[PDB]
Amino acid sequence: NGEPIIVPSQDVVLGLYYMTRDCVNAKGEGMVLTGPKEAERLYRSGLAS
Amino acid sequence: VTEFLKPRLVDIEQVSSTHAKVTLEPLERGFGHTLGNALRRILLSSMPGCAVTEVEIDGVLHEYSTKEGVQEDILEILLNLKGLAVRVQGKDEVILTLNKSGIGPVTAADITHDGDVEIVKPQHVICHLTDENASISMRIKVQRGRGYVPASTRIGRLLVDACYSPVERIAYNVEAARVEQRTDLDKLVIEMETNGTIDPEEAIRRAATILAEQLEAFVD
Amino acid sequence: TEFLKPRLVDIEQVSSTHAKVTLEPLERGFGHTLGNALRRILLSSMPGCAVTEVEIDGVLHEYSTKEGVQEDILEILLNLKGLAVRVQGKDEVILTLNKSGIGPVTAADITHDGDVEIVKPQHVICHLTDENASISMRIKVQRGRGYVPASTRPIGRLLVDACYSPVERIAYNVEAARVEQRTDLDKLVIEMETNGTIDPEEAIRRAATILAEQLEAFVDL
Amino acid sequence: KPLVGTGMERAVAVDSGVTAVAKRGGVVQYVDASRIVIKVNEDEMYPGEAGIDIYNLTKYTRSNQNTCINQMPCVSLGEPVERGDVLADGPSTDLGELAL
Amino acid sequence: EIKELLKLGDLPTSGQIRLYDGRTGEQFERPVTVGYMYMLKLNHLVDDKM
Numbered sequence: 001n002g003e004p005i006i007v008p009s010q011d012v013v014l015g016l017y018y019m020t021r022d023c024v025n026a027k028g029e030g031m032v033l034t035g036p037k038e039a040e041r042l043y044r045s046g047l048a049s
Numbered sequence: 050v051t052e053f054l055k056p057r058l059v060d061i062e063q064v065s066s067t068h069a070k071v072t073l074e075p076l077e078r079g080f081g082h083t084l085g086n087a088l089r090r091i092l093l094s095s096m097p098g099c100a101v102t103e104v105e106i107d108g109v110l111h112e113y114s115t116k117e118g119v120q121e122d123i124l125e126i127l128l129n130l131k132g133l134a135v136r137v138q139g140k141d142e143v144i145l146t147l148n149k150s151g152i153g154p155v156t157a158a159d160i161t162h163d164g165d166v167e168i169v170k171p172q173h174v175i176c177h178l179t180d181e182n183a184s185i186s187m188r189i190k191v192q193r194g195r196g197y198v199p200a201s202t203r204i205g206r207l208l209v210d211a212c213y214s215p216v217e218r219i220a221y222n223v224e225a226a227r228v229e230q231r232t233d234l235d236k237l238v239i240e241m242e243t244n245g246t247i248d249p250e251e252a253i254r255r256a257a258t259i260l261a262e263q264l265e266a267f268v269d
Numbered sequence: 270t271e272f273l274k275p276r277l278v279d280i281e282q283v284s285s286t287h288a289k290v291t292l293e294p295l296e297r298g299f300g301h302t303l304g305n306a307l308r309r310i311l312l313s314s315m316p317g318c319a320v321t322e323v324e325i326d327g328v329l330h331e332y333s334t335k336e337g338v339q340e341d342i343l344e345i346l347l348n349l350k351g352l353a354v355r356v357q358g359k360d361e362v363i364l365t366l367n368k369s370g371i372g373p374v375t376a377a378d379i380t381h382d383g384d385v386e387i388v389k390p391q392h393v394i395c396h397l398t399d400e401n402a403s404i405s406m407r408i409k410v411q412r413g414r415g416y417v418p419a420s421t422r423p424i425g426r427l428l429v430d431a432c433y434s435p436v437e438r439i440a441y442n443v444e445a446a447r448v449e450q451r452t453d454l455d456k457l458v459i460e461m462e463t464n465g466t467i468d469p470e471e472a473i474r475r476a477a478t479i480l481a482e483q484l485e486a487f488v489d490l
Numbered sequence: 491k492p493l494v495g496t497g498m499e500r501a502v503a504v505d506s507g508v509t510a511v512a513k514r515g516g517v518v519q520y521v522d523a524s525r526i527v528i529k530v531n532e533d534e535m536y537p538g539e540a541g542i543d544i545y546n547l548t549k550y551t552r553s554n555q556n557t558c559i560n561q562m563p564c565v566s567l568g569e570p571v572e573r574g575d576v577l578a579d580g581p582s583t584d585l586g587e588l589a590l
Numbered sequence: 591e592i593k594e595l596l597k598l599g600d601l602p603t604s605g606q607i608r609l610y611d612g613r614t615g616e617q618f619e620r621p622v623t624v625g626y627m628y629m630l631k632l633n634h635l636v637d638d639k640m
Contacts, residue, residue: 398521399520
């Protein structure tokens, strides 16, 4: 058929799904950022969820 | 004996003036993580520098206010000021003034010249004037500190987050290395991007120096 | 733009195998950095002594028995694998054991040597169940670090895998301090459980020395 | 031994026949890594026999699948034993229970 | 009954505790199930198959 044969599953899918979920009143809510690098810095520092 | 492997091969790639990749080989089992995590933590949370802290605009009175004559909003102006790199030579606090009249871009080059204040990238865009008659004036506080102090914790003036450290991004990876008849060794790769105030290699030097200094009463 | 420097402020001893060390003061974030680095260095790099070779007068291999002895030769080697020795003036030593009579044979029966001391004399080695039985052996002890199986390096020589590491459990904690008149200083407490063959303060000094010598490379460019 | 079990381990270990089970009661006289000697109680003797039970154990013998069969004692000098008691363990047995 | 035994042993009655990553020293975000289990080694050895 015309479908791709390489496809992630299992732990990759669960990790990407958890990574992109959304909560309410988590730590760091309401900030305005300059870009993705600021988000990475804030998350790896420990100042944001 | 008490001798451990010391690396012999050091490789540096300069992607940009503010972008570096460093490779070190060979290490002993487990030492790549040990060095990389400590270096990353120090470079991320314990580096000193100068940054903008507080701003004041005569026309505006609140973060949600709207001023006629400017295409952008107050939030965008604060966001642009948040990423303005600068150096201070021999002081700790300083106030800067910006005035411009006309229609067109408003750029960091327009900042009034000072003696102990140096601009890193002059072609930095702060504002835009749609109308010829409109004009904007402001004052800027620049201080000294460490790490990253958000404005929320600090709690007609506006406060913005302060980025004292010159590090924009830092990351590392560990791979396999095989000295002859010993195929379980470490190879360390480090990726760094700074804000242009200092060179990334120079920052790595400061990080290593600080770490080696803080443990000095225990080394026998 | 200056940092205060930590110092040793306490060494609390609980027993012959349990110790606590206190470092004071630390700046923001340095407690976890130093704690994790030291925990990783301590669990893999400390040197120590271990048994590597065994001789027994009548035995040819470990898949056999001895008349009058309760245990197999293999069980005897397994027992011998867990003997703790402090060696002072060398990296090699050969100990001798001779015993007769009914009863346990422990480490207290090993011949006394001036430069060698045994930290657990009650360590049980084997048993004798007949009054006419006797045992006689020679034990070779060396120094090193890490884990060296006998597989990766005369009929009668018996080899045993050597575990040189004297450290068994490491934990650490970070707490608020009250140094001077500030309110942003911390203290780091390290708890270690060992086999009683290494002094804790020397271990901390050796770990710090290893870390500094490793860091000397990044200072240059 | 397993930390969590069902209670059927002793029955399998004993009915397998890989351990050594005492025939008559008494007391342990000589114990060794190859031999066990039991002195029989008076109530279980016979008019014309000495009263000594001798057990020889299997040491490092290959099985049908090229594995190892070995027996080791689990009784001490001078202890008393009743009939139907485990005297030594075979492979995969721990104090008379099946241990895989 | 399992929870009563756990409470007698001075352990949480959920079976989950907090863990830390041994490479960085950082704490995992959710509590993890930790316990004891019986495991077996089978007669399928890679030394006999390569």
